[PDB]
């Protein structure tokens, strides 16, 4: 039903903008643009986050109560949209959900895309106000979105700068606008400790913690269960991001809906760390020389090393062991309702529905 | 006001401290602190601080004097509007291909930053506000009213920034979801060159976050009830002031000195619907309208020189001076209708320091 409800939350927000003191023709233009900004970026995904709000709420506890839950559910889908528009600018994305990235469109470009990230982000809080301002969890829901957003921003910053020169005794150069940085990996950062730090922040909080907490706050949970949920969410985000990093190398872009770019974008990935952990000293030198380069021969070397050190096999073994670790933590929850949803989510996570 | 200048470090370090509580390795926490301290210092400092100072003054002149704990909450809100200014200017300079901001290179231009960090940093600066309002005002009765004013002021600014950026775009003069290879050739839309459309843009991109938001912050914190009719009068004065302030800005883009303004002029080449463009279109001959269509929105010296020459020809400097004189009077007349001596002094004073600061 949540999928039918989409139009309702979008049109509620578009109606808010239509109340602005603008000339009728200008209101018509802004409606056309923003309807597309929402449809294009909120639709086409698995909707795992939104569906998770709906299920957690149902299994913790009418149409009026569903109107509030589906609002929160669509707000996380709007947050996903905001983060993916910004991520694709940052990661020089080509494709998103089998459509061109929003920032690439000649009618949009980076100039609109930056402004649109802020619009999508701010639409959430207007929608929570419209549907939940008189709820007791209202300020607690507002704070959950803000804290999970702040954590994602830090994660995105680490993902984007972990190998940067400013981090590899000297300070950021405020006088350099002409000498580009040559991306090189920092071997001191190639460890799972650093990787887990990035991954819990850029994915776990907004993808797992935020939807579960939304459903729980709305259903009325005040409680030490929230720390257990936080810990499961971290295990789940790590598991989900490792699979994503796997797909960037071994996935099919027609199936994933996006084009792989981590080797050329100098990302600290799970396949990188796993390879560094297993490979020979000359192969470490090969990685340093060829990683972080938007050049076919360079990415081919890295890709060949991922085949050589059987990264596909190590991932399969990781997934098996991490799913067990997640299930073991879920069993310690002592809440049958939440446990069913989380066990179910774990099964559909990579496929959706 | 002295409390404001000196308490910057306090709000900056309170937010930095919040991030230092994250589950991160000690060396990674040290790197995040170094980066974010600079993102705040570089983009929150160097301005007139008119918005922040306005919160401080409105609060002071609404109340009957104020303890340090009350000042801590006012200066928080004041610095939060300076952080909002920082977020909006960082994004604005990406959109407008800015070169200089407050006599320093724009943040997005730095090789250690770039657009990839700048976009993420706009979101950080924006979200830092709400964390700071929570830390210092969560137990206040105006708490929900303050965060709602920030988000509505921001939503209105985003719409104006969109109109400022797309008013002359082909999609407005259906959006093509299949075109990522055929660039749009920037052209002015003569049907949009009117003050009606101009006021719609400037009221949204400037008046709400620059005038309405800081006055309402000081008023909500001082305890004026959200149902009070004075808030609509303030909204109307803020619109008059926002329009007045933006027109002066457009004036400075052509006639200002970049060492004094701290920024390099670009509205002609960036194809903006400005006050000098509308005033010239209103006064000029049909062949001069053709000259504008042919030479505006072109990053080319000869093309910009034509537009500059037309602004000298139609005495835009003189028409601006006549506008400023008439708009200042209209603002003062609306201020006199407030029936609040405290707010009236602050707004009269603001109107004097608006272009200089202090
Ligand atoms: O690999 P990323 O972190 O950029 C990604 O997973 C998106 N993302 C953004 C934040 N967390 C995850 P995507 O591979 O979809 O481009
Ligand atoms: O001319 P803009 O509106 O882009 C500007 O005034 C910034 N701005 C952005 C919104 N309102 C004002 P700036 O000339 O400082 O680059
Ligand atoms: C956050 C990660 C790891 C990848 C993007 O999220 P999803 O894979 O949930 O994207 P959609 O289903 O929303 O397309
Ligand atoms: C919003 C407009 C019109 C120009 C930028 O604002 P300011 O001129 O107040 O900028 P700073 O004082 O903050 O540099
Ligand atoms: Mg990314
Ligand atoms: Mg990406
Ligand atoms: Mg990925
Ligand atoms: Mg600008
Ligand atoms: Mg601008
Ligand atoms: Mg300007």
GROMACS .gro file of N, CA, C and O in nm, chain A residues 13 17 20-23 25-26 29-30 33-34 36 90 100 104-107 111-112 114-115 118-119 121-122 125-126 142 146-147 149-151 153-154 156-158 160-161 166-167 172-179 189 193-194 197 201, chain B residues 15 19 22-25 27-28 31-32 35-36 38 42 95 105 109-112 116-117 119-120 123-124 126-127 130-131 134 144 151-152 154-156 158-159 161-163 165-166 171-172 175-180 182 192 196-197 200 204:
model
  460
   13UNK      N    1   0.372   1.796  -0.031
   13UNK     CA    2   0.486   1.887  -0.035
   13UNK      C    3   0.477   1.984  -0.150
   13UNK      O    4   0.503   2.101  -0.129
   17UNK      N    5   0.461   2.429  -0.161
   17UNK     CA    6   0.535   2.523  -0.244
   17UNK      C    7   0.438   2.610  -0.325
   17UNK      O    8   0.464   2.728  -0.348
   20UNK      N    9   0.336   2.955  -0.194
   20UNK     CA   10   0.434   3.065  -0.195
   20UNK      C   11   0.380   3.182  -0.277
   20UNK      O   12   0.303   3.161  -0.371
   21UNK      N   13   0.422   3.305  -0.244
   21UNK     CA   14   0.381   3.427  -0.315
   21UNK      C   15   0.460   3.440  -0.447
   21UNK      O   16   0.563   3.508  -0.455
   22UNK      N   17   0.412   3.366  -0.548
   22UNK     CA   18   0.473   3.360  -0.681
   22UNK      C   19   0.367   3.378  -0.787
   22UNK      O   20   0.250   3.349  -0.762
   23UNK      N   21   0.406   3.428  -0.906
   23UNK     CA   22   0.318   3.448  -1.020
   23UNK      C   23   0.272   3.310  -1.067
   23UNK      O   24   0.352   3.216  -1.066
   25UNK      N   25   0.220   3.153  -1.348
   25UNK     CA   26   0.304   3.087  -1.450
   25UNK      C   27   0.433   3.031  -1.387
   25UNK      O   28   0.475   2.921  -1.424
   26UNK      N   29   0.493   3.104  -1.290
   26UNK     CA   30   0.614   3.062  -1.218
   26UNK      C   31   0.582   2.940  -1.127
   26UNK      O   32   0.662   2.846  -1.124
   29UNK      N   33   0.570   2.631  -1.340
   29UNK     CA   34   0.705   2.588  -1.374
   29UNK      C   35   0.772   2.515  -1.259
   29UNK      O   36   0.834   2.411  -1.281
   30UNK      N   37   0.757   2.568  -1.136
   30UNK     CA   38   0.819   2.506  -1.019
   30UNK      C   39   0.753   2.369  -0.988
   30UNK      O   40   0.824   2.275  -0.951
   33UNK      N   41   0.892   2.105  -1.248
   33UNK     CA   42   1.031   2.073  -1.213
   33UNK      C   43   1.039   1.986  -1.091
   33UNK      O   44   1.108   1.884  -1.094
   34UNK      N   45   0.973   2.026  -0.982
   34UNK     CA   46   0.984   1.952  -0.856
   34UNK      C   47   0.911   1.819  -0.854
   34UNK      O   48   0.962   1.726  -0.789
   36UNK      N   49   0.902   1.615  -1.111
   36UNK     CA   50   1.004   1.532  -1.175
   36UNK      C   51   1.121   1.504  -1.080
   36UNK      O   52   1.162   1.389  -1.072
   90UNK      N   53   2.953   1.343  -0.628
   90UNK     CA   54   3.079   1.312  -0.562
   90UNK      C   55   3.156   1.197  -0.628
   90UNK      O   56   3.278   1.204  -0.638
  100UNK      N   57   1.991   0.790  -1.625
  100UNK     CA   58   2.108   0.875  -1.608
  100UNK      C   59   2.094   0.946  -1.475
  100UNK      O   60   1.983   0.979  -1.434
  104UNK      N   61   2.363   1.488  -1.433
  104UNK     CA   62   2.414   1.478  -1.569
  104UNK      C   63   2.320   1.539  -1.673
  104UNK      O   64   2.368   1.578  -1.780
  105UNK      N   65   2.189   1.546  -1.643
  105UNK     CA   66   2.087   1.600  -1.734
  105UNK      C   67   2.116   1.745  -1.763
  105UNK      O   68   2.143   1.823  -1.671
  106UNK      N   69   2.112   1.782  -1.893
  106UNK     CA   70   2.141   1.918  -1.941
  106UNK      C   71   2.040   2.021  -1.891
  106UNK      O   72   2.075   2.138  -1.882
  107UNK      N   73   1.920   1.977  -1.853
  107UNK     CA   74   1.817   2.064  -1.796
  107UNK      C   75   1.838   2.083  -1.645
  107UNK      O   76   1.775   2.170  -1.585
  111UNK      N   77   2.478   2.258  -1.088
  111UNK     CA   78   2.420   2.379  -1.029
  111UNK      C   79   2.279   2.355  -0.972
  111UNK      O   80   2.252   2.398  -0.862
  112UNK      N   81   2.192   2.281  -1.044
  112UNK     CA   82   2.060   2.252  -0.989
  112UNK      C   83   2.066   2.139  -0.892
  112UNK      O   84   2.001   2.146  -0.788
  114UNK      N   85   2.287   2.046  -0.673
  114UNK     CA   86   2.331   2.087  -0.538
  114UNK      C   87   2.211   2.148  -0.460
  114UNK      O   88   2.186   2.115  -0.343
  115UNK      N   89   2.137   2.236  -0.529
  115UNK     CA   90   2.020   2.301  -0.473
  115UNK      C   91   1.909   2.200  -0.444
  115UNK      O   92   1.842   2.212  -0.343
  118UNK      N   93   1.938   1.987  -0.122
  118UNK     CA   94   1.888   2.070  -0.011
  118UNK      C   95   1.736   2.072  -0.012
  118UNK      O   96   1.677   2.067   0.095
  119UNK      N   97   1.673   2.079  -0.131
  119UNK     CA   98   1.527   2.075  -0.138
  119UNK      C   99   1.473   1.942  -0.088
  119UNK      O  100   1.386   1.942   0.000
  121UNK      N  101   1.617   1.717   0.099
  121UNK     CA  102   1.646   1.707   0.242
  121UNK      C  103   1.545   1.784   0.328
  121UNK      O  104   1.499   1.733   0.429
  122UNK      N  105   1.515   1.907   0.289
  122UNK     CA  106   1.425   1.992   0.366
  122UNK      C  107   1.278   1.952   0.353
  122UNK      O  108   1.203   1.977   0.448
  125UNK      N  109   1.130   1.725   0.654
  125UNK     CA  110   1.092   1.792   0.777
  125UNK      C  111   0.960   1.865   0.767
  125UNK      O  112   0.887   1.870   0.866
  126UNK      N  113   0.926   1.916   0.647
  126UNK     CA  114   0.797   1.977   0.620
  126UNK      C  115   0.692   1.865   0.624
  126UNK      O  116   0.586   1.883   0.686
  142UNK      N  117   1.237   1.393   1.442
  142UNK     CA  118   1.315   1.504   1.386
  142UNK      C  119   1.465   1.483   1.419
  142UNK      O  120   1.548   1.487   1.328
  146UNK      N  121   1.801   1.391   1.181
  146UNK     CA  122   1.915   1.483   1.186
  146UNK      C  123   2.044   1.414   1.226
  146UNK      O  124   2.147   1.443   1.164
  147UNK      N  125   2.040   1.328   1.328
  147UNK     CA  126   2.159   1.260   1.378
  147UNK      C  127   2.212   1.155   1.280
  147UNK      O  128   2.335   1.149   1.259
  149UNK      N  129   2.153   1.171   0.950
  149UNK     CA  130   2.202   1.255   0.840
  149UNK      C  131   2.343   1.309   0.870
  149UNK      O  132   2.429   1.300   0.783
  150UNK      N  133   2.369   1.359   0.992
  150UNK     CA  134   2.501   1.410   1.035
  150UNK      C  135   2.607   1.298   1.029
  150UNK      O  136   2.719   1.322   0.983
  151UNK      N  137   2.572   1.177   1.072
  151UNK     CA  138   2.659   1.061   1.067
  151UNK      C  139   2.691   1.018   0.923
  151UNK      O  140   2.806   0.987   0.894
  153UNK      N  141   2.687   1.219   0.650
  153UNK     CA  142   2.771   1.328   0.598
  153UNK      C  143   2.920   1.303   0.636
  153UNK      O  144   3.008   1.314   0.549
  154UNK      N  145   2.947   1.264   0.762
  154UNK     CA  146   3.083   1.234   0.811
  154UNK      C  147   3.140   1.113   0.735
  154UNK      O  148   3.253   1.120   0.688
  156UNK      N  149   3.048   1.000   0.433
  156UNK     CA  150   3.067   1.045   0.295
  156UNK      C  151   3.194   1.126   0.279
  156UNK      O  152   3.262   1.115   0.178
  157UNK      N  153   3.227   1.206   0.380
  157UNK     CA  154   3.350   1.283   0.386
  157UNK      C  155   3.471   1.186   0.397
  157UNK      O  156   3.568   1.202   0.325
  158UNK      N  157   3.463   1.085   0.486
  158UNK     CA  158   3.571   0.988   0.502
  158UNK      C  159   3.589   0.903   0.375
  158UNK      O  160   3.701   0.883   0.329
  160UNK      N  161   3.535   0.989   0.072
  160UNK     CA  162   3.584   1.084  -0.026
  160UNK      C  163   3.725   1.135   0.004
  160UNK      O  164   3.794   1.178  -0.089
  161UNK      N  165   3.771   1.131   0.131
  161UNK     CA  166   3.901   1.190   0.167
  161UNK      C  167   4.000   1.102   0.240
  161UNK      O  168   4.110   1.149   0.268
  166UNK      N  169   4.583   1.584   0.231
  166UNK     CA  170   4.561   1.658   0.356
  166UNK      C  171   4.562   1.568   0.479
  166UNK      O  172   4.593   1.616   0.588
  167UNK      N  173   4.532   1.437   0.460
  167UNK     CA  174   4.529   1.335   0.567
  167UNK      C  175   4.655   1.245   0.567
  167UNK      O  176   4.678   1.174   0.664
  172UNK      N  177   4.541   2.195   0.523
  172UNK     CA  178   4.468   2.217   0.397
  172UNK      C  179   4.518   2.347   0.333
  172UNK      O  180   4.527   2.450   0.400
  173UNK      N  181   4.556   2.340   0.205
  173UNK     CA  182   4.608   2.455   0.132
  173UNK      C  183   4.493   2.537   0.072
  173UNK      O  184   4.430   2.497  -0.028
  174UNK      N  185   4.470   2.655   0.134
  174UNK     CA  186   4.366   2.751   0.098
  174UNK      C  187   4.412   2.841  -0.018
  174UNK      O  188   4.338   2.932  -0.057
  175UNK      N  189   4.533   2.817  -0.073
  175UNK     CA  190   4.587   2.896  -0.184
  175UNK      C  191   4.603   2.815  -0.311
  175UNK      O  192   4.636   2.870  -0.415
  176UNK      N  193   4.573   2.685  -0.303
  176UNK     CA  194   4.582   2.598  -0.420
  176UNK      C  195   4.443   2.574  -0.482
  176UNK      O  196   4.360   2.503  -0.425
  177UNK      N  197   4.423   2.633  -0.602
  177UNK     CA  198   4.303   2.619  -0.684
  177UNK      C  199   4.340   2.571  -0.825
  177UNK      O  200   4.251   2.555  -0.908
  178UNK      N  201   4.472   2.548  -0.852
  178UNK     CA  202   4.521   2.514  -0.986
  178UNK      C  203   4.602   2.385  -0.999
  178UNK      O  204   4.609   2.332  -1.111
  179UNK      N  205   4.666   2.338  -0.890
  179UNK     CA  206   4.749   2.216  -0.890
  179UNK      C  207   4.663   2.096  -0.841
  179UNK      O  208   4.646   2.079  -0.720
  189UNK      N  209   4.590   0.333   0.582
  189UNK     CA  210   4.443   0.337   0.589
  189UNK      C  211   4.379   0.209   0.539
  189UNK      O  212   4.258   0.190   0.557
  193UNK      N  213   3.949  -0.181   1.021
  193UNK     CA  214   3.917  -0.091   1.132
  193UNK      C  215   3.867   0.043   1.082
  193UNK      O  216   3.759   0.089   1.120
  194UNK      N  217   3.944   0.102   0.989
  194UNK     CA  218   3.916   0.228   0.919
  194UNK      C  219   3.792   0.207   0.830
  194UNK      O  220   3.700   0.287   0.834
  197UNK      N  221   3.467   0.207   1.022
  197UNK     CA  222   3.441   0.346   1.061
  197UNK      C  223   3.364   0.423   0.952
  197UNK      O  224   3.272   0.497   0.984
  201UNK      N  225   2.916   0.483   0.919
  201UNK     CA  226   2.871   0.620   0.908
  201UNK      C  227   2.803   0.649   0.773
  201UNK      O  228   2.692   0.700   0.774
  368UNK      N  229   2.999   2.216   1.839
  368UNK     CA  230   2.965   2.125   1.730
  368UNK      C  231   3.080   2.030   1.699
  368UNK      O  232   3.055   1.912   1.678
  372UNK      N  233   3.100   1.584   1.709
  372UNK     CA  234   3.156   1.491   1.612
  372UNK      C  235   3.267   1.408   1.675
  372UNK      O  236   3.284   1.290   1.644
  375UNK      N  237   3.170   1.064   1.809
  375UNK     CA  238   3.143   0.955   1.714
  375UNK      C  239   3.240   0.838   1.735
  375UNK      O  240   3.354   0.860   1.776
  376UNK      N  241   3.195   0.715   1.703
  376UNK     CA  242   3.276   0.594   1.716
  376UNK      C  243   3.373   0.587   1.597
  376UNK      O  244   3.347   0.521   1.496
  377UNK      N  245   3.486   0.660   1.611
  377UNK     CA  246   3.591   0.668   1.510
  377UNK      C  247   3.727   0.651   1.576
  377UNK      O  248   3.741   0.679   1.694
  378UNK      N  249   3.827   0.603   1.500
  378UNK     CA  250   3.964   0.587   1.548
  378UNK      C  251   4.021   0.724   1.576
  378UNK      O  252   3.994   0.818   1.501
  380UNK      N  253   4.301   0.887   1.533
  380UNK     CA  254   4.369   0.956   1.423
  380UNK      C  255   4.266   1.010   1.321
  380UNK      O  256   4.284   1.121   1.271
  381UNK      N  257   4.156   0.935   1.297
  381UNK     CA  258   4.049   0.976   1.205
  381UNK      C  259   3.971   1.095   1.266
  381UNK      O  260   3.941   1.190   1.192
  384UNK      N  261   4.173   1.408   1.211
  384UNK     CA  262   4.162   1.454   1.073
  384UNK      C  263   4.030   1.527   1.049
  384UNK      O  264   4.030   1.631   0.985
  385UNK      N  265   3.918   1.472   1.101
  385UNK     CA  266   3.783   1.530   1.087
  385UNK      C  267   3.778   1.667   1.159
  385UNK      O  268   3.719   1.761   1.106
  388UNK      N  269   3.975   1.935   0.947
  388UNK     CA  270   3.898   1.969   0.828
  388UNK      C  271   3.780   2.055   0.861
  388UNK      O  272   3.761   2.157   0.796
  389UNK      N  273   3.698   2.013   0.959
  389UNK     CA  274   3.575   2.084   0.990
  389UNK      C  275   3.595   2.217   1.062
  389UNK      O  276   3.517   2.310   1.037
  391UNK      N  277   3.838   2.424   0.991
  391UNK     CA  278   3.864   2.508   0.875
  391UNK      C  279   3.735   2.535   0.793
  391UNK      O  280   3.712   2.649   0.757
  395UNK      N  281   3.671   2.928   0.769
  395UNK     CA  282   3.683   2.977   0.631
  395UNK      C  283   3.553   3.035   0.576
  395UNK      O  284   3.557   3.133   0.504
  448UNK      N  285   2.709   2.713  -0.795
  448UNK     CA  286   2.605   2.744  -0.893
  448UNK      C  287   2.639   2.858  -0.985
  448UNK      O  288   2.602   2.855  -1.102
  458UNK      N  289   3.963   3.263  -0.195
  458UNK     CA  290   3.910   3.180  -0.303
  458UNK      C  291   3.789   3.107  -0.248
  458UNK      O  292   3.789   3.070  -0.130
  462UNK      N  293   3.664   2.571  -0.496
  462UNK     CA  294   3.776   2.585  -0.590
  462UNK      C  295   3.905   2.522  -0.537
  462UNK      O  296   3.990   2.484  -0.617
  463UNK      N  297   3.919   2.512  -0.404
  463UNK     CA  298   4.038   2.456  -0.340
  463UNK      C  299   4.055   2.309  -0.380
  463UNK      O  300   3.959   2.231  -0.375
  464UNK      N  301   4.178   2.272  -0.423
  464UNK     CA  302   4.214   2.136  -0.467
  464UNK      C  303   4.201   2.031  -0.357
  464UNK      O  304   4.181   1.913  -0.388
  465UNK      N  305   4.206   2.076  -0.228
  465UNK     CA  306   4.187   1.989  -0.113
  465UNK      C  307   4.039   1.966  -0.083
  465UNK      O  308   4.003   1.876  -0.005
  469UNK      N  309   3.301   1.796  -0.498
  469UNK     CA  310   3.266   1.672  -0.426
  469UNK      C  311   3.260   1.695  -0.273
  469UNK      O  312   3.169   1.646  -0.209
  470UNK      N  313   3.354   1.772  -0.216
  470UNK     CA  314   3.348   1.797  -0.073
  470UNK      C  315   3.255   1.910  -0.043
  470UNK      O  316   3.178   1.901   0.052
  472UNK      N  317   2.973   2.004  -0.178
  472UNK     CA  318   2.832   1.959  -0.174
  472UNK      C  319   2.802   1.892  -0.037
  472UNK      O  320   2.699   1.919   0.026
  473UNK      N  321   2.892   1.803   0.008
  473UNK     CA  322   2.880   1.734   0.135
  473UNK      C  323   2.888   1.832   0.253
  473UNK      O  324   2.814   1.817   0.348
  476UNK      N  325   2.568   2.042   0.331
  476UNK     CA  326   2.483   1.957   0.413
  476UNK      C  327   2.532   1.954   0.556
  476UNK      O  328   2.449   1.953   0.646
  477UNK      N  329   2.666   1.949   0.578
  477UNK     CA  330   2.720   1.951   0.713
  477UNK      C  331   2.688   2.082   0.783
  477UNK      O  332   2.634   2.079   0.893
  479UNK      N  333   2.463   2.306   0.712
  479UNK     CA  334   2.320   2.315   0.731
  479UNK      C  335   2.271   2.234   0.851
  479UNK      O  336   2.188   2.281   0.929
  480UNK      N  337   2.319   2.112   0.865
  480UNK     CA  338   2.275   2.026   0.974
  480UNK      C  339   2.335   2.064   1.108
  480UNK      O  340   2.273   2.035   1.210
  483UNK      N  341   2.096   2.280   1.349
  483UNK     CA  342   1.993   2.207   1.423
  483UNK      C  343   2.050   2.133   1.543
  483UNK      O  344   1.982   2.127   1.645
  484UNK      N  345   2.175   2.084   1.533
  484UNK     CA  346   2.245   2.025   1.646
  484UNK      C  347   2.275   2.134   1.750
  484UNK      O  348   2.251   2.111   1.868
  487UNK      N  349   1.961   2.245   1.930
  487UNK     CA  350   1.925   2.138   2.023
  487UNK      C  351   2.007   2.151   2.151
  487UNK      O  352   1.950   2.147   2.260
  497UNK      N  353   1.062   2.437   1.895
  497UNK     CA  354   1.000   2.383   1.773
  497UNK      C  355   0.973   2.496   1.674
  497UNK      O  356   0.996   2.479   1.554
  504UNK      N  357   1.383   2.605   0.884
  504UNK     CA  358   1.354   2.519   0.771
  504UNK      C  359   1.266   2.584   0.666
  504UNK      O  360   1.289   2.556   0.549
  505UNK      N  361   1.168   2.671   0.706
  505UNK     CA  362   1.081   2.743   0.611
  505UNK      C  363   1.157   2.855   0.538
  505UNK      O  364   1.132   2.877   0.420
  507UNK      N  365   1.487   2.847   0.485
  507UNK     CA  366   1.572   2.767   0.397
  507UNK      C  367   1.495   2.719   0.273
  507UNK      O  368   1.544   2.743   0.162
  508UNK      N  369   1.375   2.657   0.290
  508UNK     CA  370   1.290   2.611   0.177
  508UNK      C  371   1.256   2.724   0.078
  508UNK      O  372   1.261   2.702  -0.043
  509UNK      N  373   1.229   2.844   0.129
  509UNK     CA  374   1.201   2.961   0.047
  509UNK      C  375   1.325   3.007  -0.030
  509UNK      O  376   1.313   3.037  -0.149
  511UNK      N  377   1.585   2.810  -0.118
  511UNK     CA  378   1.610   2.703  -0.217
  511UNK      C  379   1.525   2.728  -0.345
  511UNK      O  380   1.579   2.719  -0.456
  512UNK      N  381   1.396   2.765  -0.328
  512UNK     CA  382   1.307   2.796  -0.441
  512UNK      C  383   1.359   2.920  -0.517
  512UNK      O  384   1.366   2.914  -0.640
  514UNK      N  385   1.672   3.034  -0.527
  514UNK     CA  386   1.799   2.993  -0.589
  514UNK      C  387   1.775   2.913  -0.716
  514UNK      O  388   1.848   2.927  -0.814
  515UNK      N  389   1.668   2.833  -0.715
  515UNK     CA  390   1.624   2.758  -0.831
  515UNK      C  391   1.573   2.855  -0.939
  515UNK      O  392   1.611   2.840  -1.055
  516UNK      N  393   1.490   2.955  -0.901
  516UNK     CA  394   1.438   3.053  -0.997
  516UNK      C  395   1.550   3.141  -1.053
  516UNK      O  396   1.555   3.164  -1.173
  518UNK      N  397   1.856   3.062  -1.103
  518UNK     CA  398   1.935   2.971  -1.184
  518UNK      C  399   1.860   2.923  -1.309
  518UNK      O  400   1.927   2.885  -1.405
  519UNK      N  401   1.724   2.922  -1.308
  519UNK     CA  402   1.650   2.864  -1.420
  519UNK      C  403   1.548   2.954  -1.489
  519UNK      O  404   1.486   2.909  -1.584
  524UNK      N  405   1.366   2.482  -2.051
  524UNK     CA  406   1.258   2.404  -1.991
  524UNK      C  407   1.141   2.493  -1.947
  524UNK      O  408   1.028   2.443  -1.939
  525UNK      N  409   1.167   2.625  -1.923
  525UNK     CA  410   1.068   2.726  -1.883
  525UNK      C  411   1.028   2.820  -1.998
  525UNK      O  412   0.924   2.886  -1.989
  528UNK      N  413   1.088   1.879  -1.937
  528UNK     CA  414   1.229   1.847  -1.906
  528UNK      C  415   1.269   1.716  -1.978
  528UNK      O  416   1.197   1.616  -1.970
  529UNK      N  417   1.379   1.721  -2.052
  529UNK     CA  418   1.430   1.607  -2.128
  529UNK      C  419   1.520   1.519  -2.040
  529UNK      O  420   1.635   1.554  -2.012
  530UNK      N  421   1.466   1.403  -2.001
  530UNK     CA  422   1.532   1.303  -1.918
  530UNK      C  423   1.628   1.214  -2.001
  530UNK      O  424   1.691   1.123  -1.946
  531UNK      N  425   1.640   1.240  -2.133
  531UNK     CA  426   1.728   1.163  -2.222
  531UNK      C  427   1.847   1.244  -2.273
  531UNK      O  428   1.937   1.189  -2.337
  532UNK      N  429   1.849   1.374  -2.242
  532UNK     CA  430   1.957   1.459  -2.285
  532UNK      C  431   2.061   1.484  -2.173
  532UNK      O  432   2.033   1.553  -2.074
  533UNK      N  433   2.182   1.428  -2.192
  533UNK     CA  434   2.300   1.444  -2.107
  533UNK      C  435   2.421   1.484  -2.194
  533UNK      O  436   2.532   1.494  -2.140
  535UNK      N  437   2.369   1.720  -2.519
  535UNK     CA  438   2.341   1.844  -2.592
  535UNK      C  439   2.326   1.962  -2.492
  535UNK      O  440   2.220   1.978  -2.431
  545UNK      N  441   1.038   3.729  -1.924
  545UNK     CA  442   1.076   3.721  -1.784
  545UNK      C  443   1.142   3.849  -1.735
  545UNK      O  444   1.162   3.865  -1.614
  549UNK      N  445   0.812   4.218  -1.166
  549UNK     CA  446   0.719   4.125  -1.103
  549UNK      C  447   0.784   3.991  -1.074
  549UNK      O  448   0.782   3.943  -0.960
  550UNK      N  449   0.847   3.934  -1.177
  550UNK     CA  450   0.925   3.809  -1.177
  550UNK      C  451   1.048   3.831  -1.087
  550UNK      O  452   1.075   3.748  -1.000
  553UNK      N  453   0.972   3.821  -0.717
  553UNK     CA  454   0.945   3.681  -0.683
  553UNK      C  455   1.074   3.604  -0.648
  553UNK      O  456   1.075   3.527  -0.552
  557UNK      N  457   1.245   3.546  -0.233
  557UNK     CA  458   1.273   3.407  -0.198
  557UNK      C  459   1.422   3.377  -0.179
  557UNK      O  460   1.458   3.329  -0.072
   0.00000   0.00000   0.00000
